[PDB]
RNA sequence: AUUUUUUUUUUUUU
RNA sequence: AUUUUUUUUUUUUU
RNA sequence: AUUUUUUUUUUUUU
RNA sequence: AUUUUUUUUUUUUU
């Protein structure tokens, strides 16, 4: 033996991520992602498994962690909708199912302090910022790889952006019932969460429905040492896993 | 005709009655089950998961800062936090433990309290987390809390202490609603030595408090909770 | 604990434990791993052998979601319909789209989970009242007709849709109850308490509300004709879930609901965390 | 330790019957320990 | 006696006894030992063989405490609630903290013992009356909701707590009864008829009254709306104990009770021992 | 549908009816039994315990002195006490025997009457305790009571006599309420010789009367007792 | 000497059932003779 | 109250 | 184009 | 610090 | 996450 729980390697396709100050990997509800079995299947079409071209790590854009920063939310598969062959099969097909490996980067020094809550939420239905029976419009729940900055302003047709109330009326402290992992700068620099396909249908449309949402939330505020720049980068890298596509057609057009 | 006699309680509607009734949709075949992960069979399964305690309650509006217990450097013999252990009220009220606890009238068992240190890796501290069993007051210095159920926590590479609150009670069950006879005691933390920050780092570091239930936990006599209400019905 | 089950007295609560001076520390943990370590009281203090005389049976989700709760209160009356244009607005009949998210007390118990699948047990109670002057109390019969989606909707109380050759209906007396069972009628394998999606890719379609948690609709009327007086019949529908399966435990909601199927909460709402009457170190 | 005798179903449908009873399955580990590497108690969590 | 049981006719009452001229005297005793010697009539007189055709079955404490007794009489009415501030004071609804020590007849049978543990059987009877002028008798339905400690209390008759998603409730007609069983709900292994203690070490806390004999509380209302008249519904709760176990037989109380849970008796009370109409030697 | 016929008595509420009824708290697990001493299974167990008879009823208010039968020295052929044996009334009414006897309509069996002498150890007496079976009057001299069921009591180191009242009745059961047809007889005590006090001791010595039931005792047809009442309900 | 046939419990709870019946235990000795040394009848009580 | 200590072998965490 | 999927056992890194 | 409790059989006073 | 490919034999349409 002599190995570490800290030093991990995830290889998927032609992409490889190494980490040396990891904590563990979280496997959501103790379940690895799989392909759709015949006993659960309903759609008669033979599914497409493009595995090497689509089950690979895609790196999202980086987010600046400041002291006054609130948090960021990403929707899946919406974040990976312009990313290579996966996003192309996402629009050319009417159906599709996918699991994910999410790896969130944030490295610092031993003088730094701060803690992030990386959490995956199944069916994270957002609340409108106006209340009542107001709905959230399509483009505000489908931002792409840019995600939702929760420290931004209220905008018409969009969701509420209070990080405390989790954008759905539940408090932030009870968000640990969902599959979660911390990034503590004294301990951790990465978080790995492996998501299976969680739905009440065997296979679903990947453009009108987001199965899970990924929230990176600073619980403890960022404290840089004296004279350091008051900023750290956060990077999100998501890889599809066991991805099937069914019902190929002529690329449906989504709003914007 | 079989000669029968109808009892008192014929024609009553008891909401908790578990009988059979005719199916309004005969020969209906429902959608077959597929495998969905995360299946819940019991609410005693999901209260053994830690969730954060909003314990820094000293804010006029609810904040993320309410989950952060402040921790000051170069302090000696002082107190970090303190609360009573009414788990259906106070800091525990909005917690996933204490929101399922208020669905039931009686609780019994051991609690599992955690603390996670989120300061710099070059910093060090020693803290003493103490549970005061009921009968005595809330401890007002470190020597008072030292005489109870306590652990000394050395802060290092492992960032969490887990100090269970063991079941110290004469009666076998406590009311989930706060009751003086079935009170649970007090919980506090103190500086064992100090907090030492590394050079070129100033300010406050923070603690993160968690609570969950042990497998020792019991929960009976289902009731309605006080955490939600409405004055009018909702429309679509 | 629930590790070891004995023969003389089963399922010990705490094992007998003694002093520790050891290099293995069960109470030091990393919650940055996203896991809860199963730390017992015997890992911190010295304990004695105690038993659980408890099974954890009332916290079963079959028991937790399986008692009758009031999901709808609607009102109809038995008055003269001659000269009335809209029978629905005059409440000669009234229908209800079946949902379990209008009483917030059942809704919070349901929305502790993401997906639920159960057979439904409905109990409908009808009570009358005559607020105006009347010589007697009418002996009234209520029809509750279960109207599936796509079925013709009633326009009048004496309309042709009430005959119900295919739609299931029940006829019961006011003051009494009608109890019937409805199976799991979701299109998918479970209902959706939450839906992060839309009906289709459109910029103006509705968010969250879906036919995945669609349970039908039932329409109410009074079969009797009009008397000299006006009598108001209040109808309360009670739902009991059974054969319950539930998935994905969610964070409990503390802010109040505003709508059906939406997760929206009111603006300028009150704080739900109780502020301390003192400082943080105060018991 | 008596046993109840109300096991005769009167209707033809399975939706018509009474409640299913306690599962006695009781697995908290998929929420409490959803980790890839098994983590013993007493051992250090990391390295 | 109950010493020897025969075959031809069982459990002899007295054995056949003859003359005694003996040095062993069974009738000379010391009650300074704190004991009652089991002296039979055959130790003093000459007896004949008689049998008990008796089992001692009605004096079993299951039978002794196991018949229905009226533990509470409360009153609600069904009137117009518009313009009423306090619904409890107007008796639109009324609640009752469950105890068995308000009717003194059951209370004396209970307080022959210190600790009792039993399952409870409740029977609630509701009878109406219209003391003012009315054209008809209303067909009313009573809700009795069992409210545990810590549950939200009702403020109004139409308040949100009556929906009872977790609290058990029963809906029955006036003139009828509702019968339901409640298990033993004490926190300890038995109820406390008597408690020589306090809730905590305080100089101003209450003596004797405790949550050890706490049995819940049930709240009453009429589900129906208001009519043209006012109708008063009287509610009588009947308790039957079953599966009774009892401990520590106590002295019977002869002075009248004054409160619930207290052993207090009125000042200047009458003598309870009957004075002889004559002297001590008078038959 | 099974064709049935409802009998007269459908919908009645009989208070003594022992049937089943639905549980309002399903799946509730009560507190497990611990061992408590002094468990009562039957009221025929606890009426075989002697309790004091307040038989010196000649007091305007209830006293400790009501339990003390006075005994005078150097008296000859006189009477110590006398009462009728209606055990649900009179001197026996407030007694633990006669407070459980009034919970039932009929009684049968033998009584166990005791007397304890509480004078000086250097004193001596001889008393004759007699039971008069029903049919005759209450005895007015010692020779009248001598013809009945009697014992001569020599007072010595053993301070108690136990004189059972045996079941002398034609009918098999007596009314616990006083009835002339089911009367039980009379009980009295007389000086057999005298009371002799030692020198330098003056005054009265006392007797202590006890009653209990034999294992021969029967008790049936439960009723409500007359020992307590109320005019209004009690509040907490 | 007939035997009653009403032994079928209709509900699932033990609190729902009817009365337990007579104990037939019948020990008055823990109240009537709660003494340390056993005291025979006929013998002197003391010495 | 016929209980107290001396110490054996088995079980719970090695 | 007689190919597709269901799943077995062996080999390469355990 | 591989100790703690559950309880067995033997010895000292029965 | 001890999975991936090489290829065997069986089943569905030959």
From Swiss-Prot, chains B, F:
Role noted for this protein: Forms an icosahedral capsid of pseudo T=3 symmetry with capsid proteins VP2 and VP3. The capsid is 300 Angstroms in diameter, composed of 60 copies of each capsid protein and enclosing the viral positive strand RNA genome.
Location(s) in or outside the cell: Virion; Host cytoplasm
Protein name: Capsid protein VP3
Quaternary organization: Interacts with capsid protein VP0 and capsid protein VP1 to form heterotrimeric protomers. Five protomers subsequently associate to form pentamers which serve as building blocks for the capsid. Interacts with capsid protein VP4 in the mature capsid. Interacts with protein 2C; this interaction may be important for virion morphogenesis.
Top-rank lineage group of the source organism: Viruses
Signal peptide, first to last residue: none
Shown stretch of the complete protein: 332 to 567 of 2179
């Amino acid at each position: 033996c002599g190995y570490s729980d800290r030093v991990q390697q995830i290889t998927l396709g032609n992409s490889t991520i190494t980490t040396q100050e990891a904590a563990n990997a979280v496997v959501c509800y103790a379940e690895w992602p799989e392909y759709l079995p015949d006993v659960d299947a309903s759609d008669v079409n033979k599914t497409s498994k493009p595995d090497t071209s689509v089950c690979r790590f895609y790196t999202l854009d980086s987010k600046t962690w400041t002291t006054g920063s609130k948090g960021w939310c990403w929707k899946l598969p919406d974040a990976l909708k312009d990313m290579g062959v996966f996003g192309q099969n996402m629009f050319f097909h009417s159906l599709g199912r996918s699991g994910y490996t999410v790896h969130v980067q944030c490295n610092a020094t031993k003088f730094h302090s701060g803690c992030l809550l990386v959490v995956v939420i199944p069916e994270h239905q957002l609340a409108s910022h106006e209340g009542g029976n107001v709905s959230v419009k399509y483009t505000f729940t489908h931002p792409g790889e840019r995600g939702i900055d929760l420290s931004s302003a209220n905008e018409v047709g969009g969701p509420v952006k209070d990080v405390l109330y989790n954008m759905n009326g539940t408090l932030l402290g009870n968000l640990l019932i969902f599959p979660h992992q911390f990034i503590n700068l004294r301990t951790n620099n990465t978080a790995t969460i492996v998501i299976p396909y969680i739905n009440s249908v065997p296979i679903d449309s990947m453009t009108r429905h987001n199965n899970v949402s990924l929230m990176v939330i600073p619980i403890a505020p960022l404290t840089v040492p004296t004279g350091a720049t008051p900023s750290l980068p956060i990077t999100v890298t998501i890889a599809p896993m066991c991805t099937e596509f069914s019902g190929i057609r002529s690329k449906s057009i989504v709003p914007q | 005709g079989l000669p029968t006699t109808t009892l008192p309680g014929s024609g009553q509607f008891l909401t908790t009655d578990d009988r059979q009734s005719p199916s309004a949709l005969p020969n209906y075949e429902p959608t077959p089950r597929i495998h969905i992960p995360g299946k819940v069979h019991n609410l005693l399964e999901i209260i053994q998961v830690d969730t954060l305690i909003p314990m820094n309650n000293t804010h006029t509006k609810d904040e993320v800062n309410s989950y952060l217990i402040p921790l000051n450097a170069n302090r000696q013999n002082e107190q970090v936090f303190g609360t009573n252990l009414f788990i259906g009220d106070g800091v525990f009220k909005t917690t996933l433990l204490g929101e399922i606890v208020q669905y039931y009238t009686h609780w019994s068992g051991s609690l599992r309290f955690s603390l996670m240190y989120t300061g710099p890796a070059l910093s060090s501290a020693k803290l003493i987390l103490a549970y005061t069993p009921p009968g005595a007051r809330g401890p007002q210095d470190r020597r008072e809390a030292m005489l109870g159920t306590h652990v000394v926590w050395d802060i290092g590479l492992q960032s969490t202490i887990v100090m269970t609150i063991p079941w110290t009670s004469g009666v076998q069950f406590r009311y989930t609603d706060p009751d003086t006879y079935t009170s649970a005691g007090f919980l506090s933390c103190w500086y064992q030595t100090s907090l030492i920050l590394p050079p070129e780092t100033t300010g406050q570091v923070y603690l993160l408090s968690f609570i969950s239930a042990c497998p020792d936990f019991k929960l009976r006599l289902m009731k309605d909770t006080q955490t939600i209400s409405q004055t009018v019905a909702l429309t679509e | 604990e629930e590790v070891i089950v004995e023969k003389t007295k089963q399922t010990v609560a705490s094992i007998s434990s003694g002093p520790k001076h050891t290099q293995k520390v069960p109470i030091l943990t990393a919650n940055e791993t996203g896991a809860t370590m199963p730390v017992l009281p015997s890992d911190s203090i010295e304990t004695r052998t105690t038993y659980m005389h408890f099974n954890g049976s009332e916290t079963d989700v079959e028991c937790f979601l399986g008692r009758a709760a009031c999901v709808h209160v609607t009102e109809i009356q038995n008055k003269d319909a001659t000269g009335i244009d809209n029978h629905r607005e005059a409440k000669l009949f009234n229908d209800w789209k079946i949902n379990l998210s209008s009483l917030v007390q059942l809704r919070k118990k349901l929305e502790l989970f993401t997906y639920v699948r159960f057979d439904s047990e409905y109990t409908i109670l009808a009570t009358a009242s005559q607020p105006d002057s009347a010589n007697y109390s009418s002996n009234l019969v209520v029809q509750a007709m279960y109207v599936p989606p796509g079925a013709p909707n009633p326009k009048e109380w004496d309309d042709y849709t009430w005959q119900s050759a295919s739609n299931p209906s029940v006829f019961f007396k006011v003051g009494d109850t009608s109890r019937f069972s409805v199976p799991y009628v979701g299109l998918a394998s479970a209902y959706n308490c939450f839906y992060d999606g839309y009906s289709h890719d459109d910029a103006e379609t509705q968010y969250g509300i879906t036919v995945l948690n669609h349970m039908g609709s039932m329409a109410f009327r009074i079969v009797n004709e009009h008397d000299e007086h006006k009598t108001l019949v209040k109808i309360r529908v009670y739902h009991r879930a059974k054969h319950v399966e539930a998935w994905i435990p969610r964070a409990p909601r503390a802010l109040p609901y505003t709508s059906i199927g939406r997760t929206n909460y009111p603006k300028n709402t009150e704080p739900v965390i109780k502020k301390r009457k003192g400082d943080i170190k105060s018991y | 330790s008596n046993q109840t005798f109300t096991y005769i179903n009167y209707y033809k449908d399975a939706a018509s019957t009474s409640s299913a009873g306690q599962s006695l399955s009781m697995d908290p580990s998929k929420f409490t320990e959803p980790v890839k590497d098994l983590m013993l108690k007493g051992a250090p969590a990391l390295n």
